[PDB]
Amino acid sequence: VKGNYVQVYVMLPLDAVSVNNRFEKGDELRAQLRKLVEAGVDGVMVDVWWGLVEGKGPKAYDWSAYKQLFELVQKAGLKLQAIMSFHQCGGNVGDAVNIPIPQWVRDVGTRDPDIFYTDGHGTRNIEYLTLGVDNQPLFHGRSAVQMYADYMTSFRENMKEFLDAGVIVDIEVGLGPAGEMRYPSYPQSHGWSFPGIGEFICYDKYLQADFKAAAAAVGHPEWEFPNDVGQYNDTPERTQFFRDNGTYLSEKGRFFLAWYSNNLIKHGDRILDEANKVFLGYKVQLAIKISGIHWWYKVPSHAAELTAGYYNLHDRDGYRTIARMLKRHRASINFTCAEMRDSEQSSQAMSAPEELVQQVLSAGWREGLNVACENALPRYDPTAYNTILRNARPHGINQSGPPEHKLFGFTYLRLSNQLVEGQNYVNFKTFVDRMHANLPRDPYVDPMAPLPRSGPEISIEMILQAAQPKLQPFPFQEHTDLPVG
Ligand SMILES: OC[C@H]1NC[C@H](O)[C@@H](O)[C@@H]1S[C@H]1O[C@H](CO)[C@@H](O)[C@H](O)[C@H]1O
Ligand SMILES: [Cl-]
């Protein structure tokens, strides 16, 4: 029965540390976290904002508010998942507060605007630095990858005691906007709204030069980005690229989609190699976040996945390539949409979150990875919780031992007073009993081994072998066998 237990984590508020890098919510959180403990919660997740910590200048790390926050988490007796948040808070759905990346990094952009992901009209997205500059020493002598590595190293040295005490158990490495390994292909600030197909955000000069070099290297130096792709708010049928039997199927289109999605995979791999070196020997799991682009999943072109950088089609598994890249690092996948049913989505959007969830979870498990999930949108109701329960144990309870597959964890978005009062709290507490297979809370479940060094580097051609043949997902039960009631 104990093999069935799934840990439950709760996301702290976006301003758990204030926008001025001070810890102001000690009284409120102490109460709120006591309520989470009373409900059997295993831990919390928190954004560790680059903009707050390295805000005053290069290598001026001010960890003191996060230390106060983390002491409080420890005193409550909860585990902790730390996100290395190298992105801006703001513009993305649910972001109530405003925390840019460091001002001194933005100041570099006033001279070299190509440090930012750039769209086809030339608009600069300031939420994250382009993967184009991962290895370009533009930031007062440092590259973007060096900045990320130094930040993680300073985190390790400063939070060593929380690491040694087994409080911090997971490091989620932010790899893009909203901390997700993707391009900013659906930005509300540039006028996108649901369920627009999005746009390819590869027009910064660094990525343009990368494309020309890749194209010349296959004997097509003339080739350019596709220009029959429409705009943010189009539907697929209204573009020659994404329509049924469109130019996404051409040799040119295929080369472009591979190049764009490959760069994301290489960005993840490089950064995970550095993260693994940092946390070598500590009892933590490294994780990445894959964004849940469920819209247009039901049409042949998977348009919105393609623009986000996920090269996923009926005969090409664009998530198992990513999982295969992660395997050498023993990195986990944190996914989203665990609370969503296809019947809750609008028809127009051609949306299939249930199938997308099944695809990504099955890709992780086939590669031997731990897989965790989050809810995409706020939900307080039994149905949502039952949908999560189904995804947490897709073949139900195993009475003899553990089930064939299960989530390694589930993180709930997001803590507030609303969660810990009234009927909301009764529902949530019941949901946590069910995720624990109705057993008491066990702080020593899922012990981590000392992080081993990443295995040998494999090439992009080796990673891409996972794309085909595309396999059906493992069968999922329609409904959980252990509902909230
Ligand atoms: O948690 C990742 C992402 N999953 C899909 C949800 O719809 C999004 O709201 C979240 S992003 C959100 O929360 C993150 C973790 O607290 C932040 O890093 C990010 O800035 C927020 O936009
Ligand atoms: Cl296989």
The 3 state secondary structure assigned to the chain is CHHHCCEEEEECCCCCCCCCCCCCCHHHHHHHHHHHHHCCCCEEEEEEEHHHHCCCCCCCCCCHHHHHHHHHHHHHCCEEEEEEECCCECCCCCCCCCECCCHHHHHHHHHCHHHEEECCCCCEEEEEECHHHCCCCCECCECHHHHHHHHHHHHHHHCHHHHHCCCEEEEEECCCHHHCCCCCCCCHHHCCCCCCCCCCCCCCHHHHHHHHHHHHCCCCCCCCCCCCCCCCCCCHHHCCCCCCCCHHHCHHHHHHHHHHHHHHHHHHHHHHHHHHHHHCCCCCEEEEECCCCCCCCCCCCCHHHHHHCCCCECCECCCHHHHHHHHCCCCEEEECCCCCCHHHCCHHHCCCHHHHHHHHHHHHHHCCCCEEEECCCCCCCHHHHHHHHHHHCCCCCCCCCCCCCCCCEEEECCCCCCCCCHHHHHHHHHHHHHHCCCCCCCCCCCCCCCCCCCCCCCCHHHHHHHHCCCCCCCCCCCCCCCCCC
CATH value at residue 150: 3.20.20.80
Atom 2 of ligand 1, nearest CA residue? 178
Measured in Å, residue 238 CA sits from the centre of ligand 1 at 30
Binding region for substrate = 47, 87, 95, 289, 294, 336, 375-376, 414
* 50 close to 89: Cβ distance less than 8 angstroms: no
* 53 close to 7: Cβ distance less than 8 angstroms: no
Ligand 1 pocket (Cβ < 6 Å) reads 11, 47, 83, 85, 87, 89, 92-95, 178-180, 289, 336, 374, 376
* 80 close to 46: Cβ distance less than 8 angstroms: yes
Atom 13 of ligand 1, nearest CA residue? 178
Measured in Å, residue 161 CA sits from the centre of ligand 1 at 27
User: Ligand 1: which atom is nearest the Cα of residue 377?
Assistant: 7
Atom 4 of ligand 1, nearest CA residue? 376
* Nearest ligand, CA 317: 2
* Nearest ligand, CA 368: 2
Atom 8 of ligand 1, nearest CA residue? 376
Resolution for this PDB entry, in angstroms? 1.9
CA gyration radius, the chain: 22
* Experimental technique behind these coordinates: X-ray
Measured CA distances, 186 to 114, 192, 196 (Å): 19, 6, 8
| Distance from C-alpha of 189 to C-alpha of 184, rounded to nearest angstrom | 11
Tokens encoding 360: 């990504």
Measured in Å, residue 451 CA sits from the centre of ligand 2 at 26
* Nearest ligand, CA 362: 2
Measured in Å, residue 314 CA sits from the centre of ligand 1 at 28
List the catalytic residues: 180, 374
Which domain does 38 fall in, by range? 1-485
* Residue to probe by mutation, ligand 1, list 12, 14, 99, 291, most atoms within 8 Å of CB: 14
Q: Quote the number of domains for the chain.
A: 1
User: Ligand 1: which atom is nearest the Cα of residue 179?
Assistant: 18
Measured in Å, residue 169 CA sits from the centre of ligand 2 at 30
Atom 19 of ligand 1, nearest CA residue? 178
Q: How many CB atoms lie within 10 A of CB 256?
A: 26
327: amino acid identity, one letter: K
Measured in Å, residue 204 CA sits from the centre of ligand 1 at 25
* Residue to probe by mutation, ligand 1, list 89, 92, 416, most atoms within 8 Å of CB: 92
* Nearest ligand, CA 466: 2
* 301 close to 236: Cβ distance less than 8 angstroms: yes
| Neighbour-count burial of 380, counting CB atoms closer than 10 A to its CB (0-12 exposed, 13-18 middle, 19+ buried) | middle
